[PDB]
Amino acid sequence: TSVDCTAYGPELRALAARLPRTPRADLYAFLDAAHTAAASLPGALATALDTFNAEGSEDGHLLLRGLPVEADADLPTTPSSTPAPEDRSLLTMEAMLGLVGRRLGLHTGYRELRSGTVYHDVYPSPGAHHLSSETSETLLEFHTEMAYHRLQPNYVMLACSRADHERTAATLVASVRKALPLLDERTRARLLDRRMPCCVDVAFRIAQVKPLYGDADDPFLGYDRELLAPEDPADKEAVAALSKALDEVTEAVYLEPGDLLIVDNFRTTHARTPFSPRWDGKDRWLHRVYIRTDRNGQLSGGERAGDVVAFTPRG
Ligand SMILES: N=C(N)NCCC[C@@H](C(=O)O)N1CCC1=O
Ligand SMILES: O=C(O)CCC(=O)C(=O)O
Ligand SMILES: [Fe+3]
């Protein structure tokens, strides 16, 4: 699902201006400011976000296109390391992630991942491990983010400050609502609420993940093409059928500056196709944040946007 927000550029730049200019120096205060500001988002945007937050969509994602973003010459050089300096001045796309994110829920950091930071720069790095956001020429295969984590976030948000030079990197999204009809009843039944072994991402180095769960007529999805590891042959067969159906309903988003993609991380799996970096200071640069909501299991009470949580595997 996509919406063009170009007309709201002036209003959104004004809301971004309300926020503290050094977010990381006091992230709780920054996000509280973003929460107050999210109450004044343009009506069209507030409605679109509230609707997607409550109902999801058939395609599992909401793409906000044409949000404000700096001219390329005014952006810093694309980062070459992580984590980001705490004193880094606020970037417009980060302000959008603050506003849109707080309208949806609570930004969450994960202790063992990216030093526990909340805002992650997603850029290519030479010699990247194959299972990392730093990859470029190697396809980053389908994964439901932290599917193996008990405190897995409802949304993964990606805002784009720079696309890759040739605009070949595609963010792929496959939705359980489109894939499910393609599976037979026995396969659905086998997957539903059935715990299967799942490895974890490098940062967290098992877990048990239910590939499908919840209401049988509209289940949630937990899938990872690299980490999910069924052993029983019936389980492997069912996951292979699920994998094929997800491929068959794959949709692609070519992120460009000003785009903010909201992925329903309980109903999709996502990936990124290859691109060739130039190491010239203008390489692809996205900003990633994770949002927790009241959808069950994520929050137990007293949480604030900006909190960092520890690792506990599902099981
Ligand atoms: N199939 C996979 N699990 N691929 C790795 C996903 C990217 C990775 C990263 O940020 O480098 N990550 C996502 C959460 C985490 O860690
Ligand atoms: O680069 C992208 O478009 C998505 C990256 C991603 O999914 C990840 O690093 O977890
Ligand atoms: Fe991801």
Side-chain angles (χ1 to χ4, degrees), residues 114 122 132-134 140 143 145 156 158 169-172 255 270-272 275 284 286 288 290:
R114 300 288 200 105
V122 177
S132 75
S133 65
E134 292 172 353
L140 181 68
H143 59 284
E145 208 104 328
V156 173
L158 294 169
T171 304
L172 306 185
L255 295 170
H270 65 277
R272 191 223 65 248
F275 67 103
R284 189 167 183 262
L286 318 182
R288 178 177 70 189
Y290 300 127

Short mmCIF file of all heavy atoms in Angstrom, two decimals, residues 114 122 132-134 140 143 145 156 158 169-172 255 270-272 275 284 286 288 290, ligand 2:
data_model
loop_
_atom_site.label_atom_id
_atom_site.label_comp_id
_atom_site.label_asym_id
_atom_site.label_seq_id
_atom_site.Cartn_x
_atom_site.Cartn_y
_atom_site.Cartn_z
N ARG A 114 23.65 -3.76 17.24
CA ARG A 114 24.11 -2.39 16.99
C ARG A 114 24.31 -1.60 18.28
O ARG A 114 23.87 -0.46 18.41
CB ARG A 114 23.13 -1.63 16.10
CG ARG A 114 22.90 -2.25 14.72
CD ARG A 114 24.09 -2.07 13.78
NE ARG A 114 23.62 -2.25 12.41
CZ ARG A 114 23.45 -1.26 11.54
NH1 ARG A 114 23.72 0.01 11.86
NH2 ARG A 114 22.98 -1.56 10.34
N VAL A 122 21.70 1.96 7.70
CA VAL A 122 21.85 0.78 6.85
C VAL A 122 22.59 1.22 5.58
O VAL A 122 22.02 1.88 4.73
CB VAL A 122 20.47 0.17 6.50
CG1 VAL A 122 20.63 -1.02 5.55
CG2 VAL A 122 19.80 -0.30 7.79
N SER A 132 24.04 -9.89 6.94
CA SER A 132 24.06 -8.58 7.55
C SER A 132 23.55 -7.47 6.64
O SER A 132 23.56 -7.57 5.40
CB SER A 132 25.48 -8.22 8.01
OG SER A 132 26.29 -7.88 6.91
N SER A 133 23.08 -6.43 7.29
CA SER A 133 22.54 -5.27 6.61
C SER A 133 23.59 -4.55 5.77
O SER A 133 23.25 -3.71 4.92
CB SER A 133 21.98 -4.29 7.63
OG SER A 133 23.05 -3.79 8.43
N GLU A 134 24.87 -4.88 5.99
CA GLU A 134 25.97 -4.27 5.27
C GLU A 134 26.23 -4.90 3.91
O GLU A 134 27.13 -4.45 3.19
CB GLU A 134 27.25 -4.35 6.11
CG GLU A 134 27.22 -3.47 7.37
CD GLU A 134 28.41 -3.69 8.30
OE1 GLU A 134 29.22 -4.62 8.05
OE2 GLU A 134 28.53 -2.94 9.29
N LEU A 140 20.36 -10.39 0.16
CA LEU A 140 20.05 -10.57 1.59
C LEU A 140 18.66 -11.24 1.54
O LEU A 140 17.67 -10.58 1.27
CB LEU A 140 19.98 -9.21 2.31
CG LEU A 140 19.69 -9.34 3.81
CD1 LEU A 140 20.86 -9.98 4.54
CD2 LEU A 140 19.42 -7.96 4.36
N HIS A 143 13.74 -12.66 5.42
CA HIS A 143 13.71 -12.82 6.86
C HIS A 143 12.60 -11.95 7.46
O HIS A 143 12.32 -10.83 6.98
CB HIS A 143 15.06 -12.43 7.51
CG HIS A 143 15.48 -11.01 7.25
ND1 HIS A 143 16.00 -10.62 6.04
CD2 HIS A 143 15.44 -9.90 8.02
CE1 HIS A 143 16.27 -9.31 6.08
NE2 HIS A 143 15.93 -8.86 7.27
N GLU A 145 12.03 -10.02 10.66
CA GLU A 145 13.03 -9.51 11.58
C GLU A 145 12.94 -10.04 13.01
O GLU A 145 11.93 -9.83 13.66
CB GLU A 145 13.00 -7.97 11.61
CG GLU A 145 14.36 -7.36 11.97
CD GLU A 145 15.07 -6.78 10.77
OE1 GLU A 145 14.89 -7.32 9.65
OE2 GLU A 145 15.81 -5.77 10.93
N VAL A 156 9.05 -2.99 11.32
CA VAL A 156 10.39 -2.57 10.96
C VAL A 156 10.10 -1.38 10.01
O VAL A 156 9.26 -1.50 9.10
CB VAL A 156 11.15 -3.63 10.16
CG1 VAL A 156 12.48 -3.03 9.70
CG2 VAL A 156 11.39 -4.85 11.02
N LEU A 158 11.86 1.54 7.44
CA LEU A 158 13.09 1.89 6.73
C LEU A 158 12.87 3.21 6.00
O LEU A 158 11.98 3.29 5.15
CB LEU A 158 13.41 0.81 5.68
CG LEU A 158 13.77 -0.57 6.25
CD1 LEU A 158 13.81 -1.63 5.14
CD2 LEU A 158 15.12 -0.49 6.94
N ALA A 169 19.00 -1.76 -5.94
CA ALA A 169 18.66 -2.46 -4.70
C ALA A 169 17.15 -2.40 -4.47
O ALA A 169 16.60 -1.33 -4.27
CB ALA A 169 19.37 -1.82 -3.53
N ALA A 170 16.50 -3.56 -4.52
CA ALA A 170 15.06 -3.62 -4.31
C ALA A 170 14.80 -4.24 -2.93
O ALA A 170 15.44 -5.22 -2.56
CB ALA A 170 14.38 -4.48 -5.38
N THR A 171 13.87 -3.66 -2.18
CA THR A 171 13.47 -4.20 -0.89
C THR A 171 12.25 -5.05 -1.23
O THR A 171 11.21 -4.54 -1.68
CB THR A 171 13.11 -3.05 0.08
OG1 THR A 171 14.23 -2.18 0.18
CG2 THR A 171 12.76 -3.59 1.47
N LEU A 172 12.39 -6.36 -1.02
CA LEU A 172 11.31 -7.30 -1.32
C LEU A 172 10.46 -7.58 -0.09
O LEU A 172 10.99 -7.71 1.02
CB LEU A 172 11.92 -8.60 -1.83
CG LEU A 172 12.88 -8.42 -3.02
CD1 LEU A 172 13.33 -9.81 -3.50
CD2 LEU A 172 12.21 -7.64 -4.15
N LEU A 255 13.49 1.77 -2.84
CA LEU A 255 13.47 2.95 -1.97
C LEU A 255 14.25 4.10 -2.55
O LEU A 255 15.37 3.94 -3.04
CB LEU A 255 14.05 2.60 -0.58
CG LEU A 255 13.21 1.59 0.21
CD1 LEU A 255 13.97 1.12 1.46
CD2 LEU A 255 11.89 2.26 0.60
N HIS A 270 10.96 -10.09 4.57
CA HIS A 270 11.52 -9.13 3.60
C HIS A 270 12.97 -9.44 3.25
O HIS A 270 13.64 -10.20 3.96
CB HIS A 270 11.37 -7.70 4.13
CG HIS A 270 12.15 -7.43 5.37
ND1 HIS A 270 11.69 -7.77 6.62
CD2 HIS A 270 13.40 -6.95 5.53
CE1 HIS A 270 12.64 -7.51 7.51
NE2 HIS A 270 13.69 -7.01 6.88
N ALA A 271 13.45 -8.85 2.14
CA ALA A 271 14.79 -9.10 1.61
C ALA A 271 15.31 -7.90 0.84
O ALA A 271 14.58 -6.93 0.66
CB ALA A 271 14.71 -10.34 0.66
N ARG A 272 16.57 -7.96 0.40
CA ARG A 272 17.13 -6.87 -0.40
C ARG A 272 17.97 -7.47 -1.52
O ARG A 272 18.84 -8.30 -1.27
CB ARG A 272 17.99 -5.92 0.45
CG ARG A 272 18.38 -4.62 -0.31
CD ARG A 272 19.85 -4.23 -0.08
NE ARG A 272 20.75 -5.25 -0.65
CZ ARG A 272 21.54 -6.05 0.06
NH1 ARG A 272 21.58 -5.98 1.39
NH2 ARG A 272 22.28 -6.96 -0.58
N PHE A 275 23.32 -4.84 -5.16
CA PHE A 275 23.71 -3.56 -5.73
C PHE A 275 25.23 -3.46 -5.55
O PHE A 275 25.79 -4.15 -4.71
CB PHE A 275 22.97 -2.37 -5.10
CG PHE A 275 23.31 -2.10 -3.66
CD1 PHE A 275 24.16 -1.05 -3.33
CD2 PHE A 275 22.72 -2.85 -2.65
CE1 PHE A 275 24.42 -0.75 -1.99
CE2 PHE A 275 22.97 -2.55 -1.31
CZ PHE A 275 23.82 -1.50 -0.99
N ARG A 284 24.25 4.06 -0.87
CA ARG A 284 22.92 3.85 -0.31
C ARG A 284 22.95 4.02 1.20
O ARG A 284 23.86 3.53 1.90
CB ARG A 284 22.45 2.45 -0.65
CG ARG A 284 21.00 2.18 -0.31
CD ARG A 284 20.60 0.90 -0.99
NE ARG A 284 19.19 0.54 -0.80
CZ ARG A 284 18.73 -0.32 0.11
NH1 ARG A 284 19.56 -0.90 0.98
NH2 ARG A 284 17.44 -0.69 0.09
N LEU A 286 19.99 3.98 4.33
CA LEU A 286 18.66 3.95 4.93
C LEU A 286 18.83 4.12 6.44
O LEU A 286 19.93 3.98 6.98
CB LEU A 286 17.94 2.61 4.71
CG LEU A 286 18.04 1.96 3.33
CD1 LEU A 286 17.20 0.66 3.36
CD2 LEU A 286 17.53 2.92 2.25
N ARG A 288 16.94 2.63 9.88
CA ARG A 288 16.04 1.59 10.37
C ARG A 288 15.68 1.77 11.83
O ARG A 288 16.52 2.09 12.65
CB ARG A 288 16.73 0.22 10.20
CG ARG A 288 15.90 -0.99 10.72
CD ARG A 288 16.65 -2.30 10.45
NE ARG A 288 17.85 -2.44 11.27
CZ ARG A 288 18.75 -3.39 11.09
NH1 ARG A 288 18.60 -4.30 10.13
NH2 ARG A 288 19.80 -3.45 11.89
N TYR A 290 12.78 0.03 14.92
CA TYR A 290 11.84 -1.04 15.27
C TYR A 290 10.76 -0.47 16.17
O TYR A 290 11.06 0.26 17.11
CB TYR A 290 12.55 -2.15 16.02
CG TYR A 290 13.66 -2.76 15.23
CD1 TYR A 290 14.94 -2.86 15.76
CD2 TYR A 290 13.43 -3.29 13.98
CE1 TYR A 290 15.97 -3.48 15.07
CE2 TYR A 290 14.45 -3.91 13.26
CZ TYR A 290 15.72 -4.02 13.82
OH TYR A 290 16.68 -4.71 13.13
O1 LIG B 2 18.39 -2.80 2.73
C1 LIG B 2 17.21 -3.08 2.76
O2 LIG B 2 16.36 -2.63 1.88
C2 LIG B 2 16.62 -3.97 3.84
C3 LIG B 2 17.75 -4.47 4.80
C4 LIG B 2 17.25 -5.46 5.84
O3 LIG B 2 16.19 -6.03 5.72
C5 LIG B 2 18.06 -5.76 7.04
O4 LIG B 2 19.33 -5.38 7.06
O5 LIG B 2 17.52 -6.33 7.99
#
